[PDB]
Amino acid sequence: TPSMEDYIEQIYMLIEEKGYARVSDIAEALAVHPSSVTKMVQKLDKDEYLIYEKYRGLVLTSKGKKIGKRLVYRHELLEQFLRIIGVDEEKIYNDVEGIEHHLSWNSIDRIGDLVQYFEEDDARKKDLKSIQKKTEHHNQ
Amino acid sequence: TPSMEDYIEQIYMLIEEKGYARVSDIAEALAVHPSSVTKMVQKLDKDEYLIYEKYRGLVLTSKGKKIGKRLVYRHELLEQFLRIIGVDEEKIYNDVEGIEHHLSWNSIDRIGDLVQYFEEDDARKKDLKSIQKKTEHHNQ
Ligand SMILES: [Mn+2]
Ligand SMILES: [Mn+2]
Ligand SMILES: [Mn+2]
Ligand SMILES: [Mn+2]
Numbered sequence: 001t002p003s004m005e006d007y008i009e010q011i012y013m014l015i016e017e018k019g020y021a022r023v024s025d026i027a028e029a030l031a032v033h034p035s036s037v038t039k040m041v042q043k044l045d046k047d048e049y050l051i052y053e054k055y056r057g058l059v060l061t062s063k064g065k066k067i068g069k070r071l072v073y074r075h076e077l078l079e080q081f082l083r084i085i086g087v088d089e090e091k092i093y094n095d096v097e098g099i100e101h102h103l104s105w106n107s108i109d110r111i112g113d114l115v116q117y118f119e120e121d122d123a124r125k126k127d128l129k130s131i132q133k134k135t136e137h138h139n140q
Numbered sequence: 141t142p143s144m145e146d147y148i149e150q151i152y153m154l155i156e157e158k159g160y161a162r163v164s165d166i167a168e169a170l171a172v173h174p175s176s177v178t179k180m181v182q183k184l185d186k187d188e189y190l191i192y193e194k195y196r197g198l199v200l201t202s203k204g205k206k207i208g209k210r211l212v213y214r215h216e217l218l219e220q221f222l223r224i225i226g227v228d229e230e231k232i233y234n235d236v237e238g239i240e241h242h243l244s245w246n247s248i249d250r251i252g253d254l255v256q257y258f259e260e261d262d263a264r265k266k267d268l269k270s271i272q273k274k275t276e277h278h279n280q
Contacts, residue, residue: 085250098242110225
């Protein structure tokens with residue numbers, strides 16, 4: 001599920017940055033109703049991605065951690081990608097949040113190589129940028 | 141609406157390639173129930189994107205034609221893009237069909253410049269490909 005991936009990716013980030021995370025952290029983070037969060041967490045608990053105890057709070061199972069880290073890698077690769085090709089900083093999160101779920105892993109890998117391509121030599125970055133310049137010259 | 145864009149893009153292609161197009165052409169093309177197609181066409185008629193008459197069949201209004209052509213440009217740019225970075229031919233349509241709706245126009249433009257970048261010089265294409273080679277060498 002697409003919103004599943006959002007939850008897993010989000011819970012992953014919440015645990016990582018806060019250590020302790022709850023249903024409230026997810027709600028706030030996703031701007032969703034906590035009751036809806038609970039229902040989701042329960043399905044996730046059922047599919048054995050996580051564990052939601054008292055003193056424990058949310059804890060990702062070994063399986064949740066592999067997937068979660070994969071989703072986090074994917075999300076950040078997409079941001080870097082869009083940033084690299086010149087998308088306006090303000091547009092990135094939104095676009096990345098939508099497409100991340102409709103890209104195959106085979107594509108995610110090709111996007112990875114593509115980022116490497118530009119990352120290993122600025123000459124390439126300047127040639128790409130110069131295309132954007134001429135493309136938008138009628139507005140400068 | 142995302143499925144709206146699919147319909148408009150599809151009706152556009154159907155008119156272009158067949159001249160005459162009906163509700164049945166859409167159903168078949170989108171693998172959707174025709175009754176559902178009718179309901180959609182009626183909303184589209186209401187928002188003045190198209191005209192659905194007897195001898196006329198489906199006809200895009202001047203407005204439907206600008207948007208439709210824009211959606212068709214977008215869809216094909218995405219295919220070319222993925223193909224250009226090495227995504228397996230079999231994966232392209234699916235990935236393109238999902239992401240096309242969650243990319244801003246600002247991104248679609250940067251994707252355009254990026255395609256130009258590689259299209260104007262094969263040297264660039266060979267350097268990108270060589271990255272994919274080394275990336276997958278453990279499987280050759
Ligand atoms: Mn994400
Ligand atoms: Mn998302
Ligand atoms: Mn399409
Ligand atoms: Mn689509």
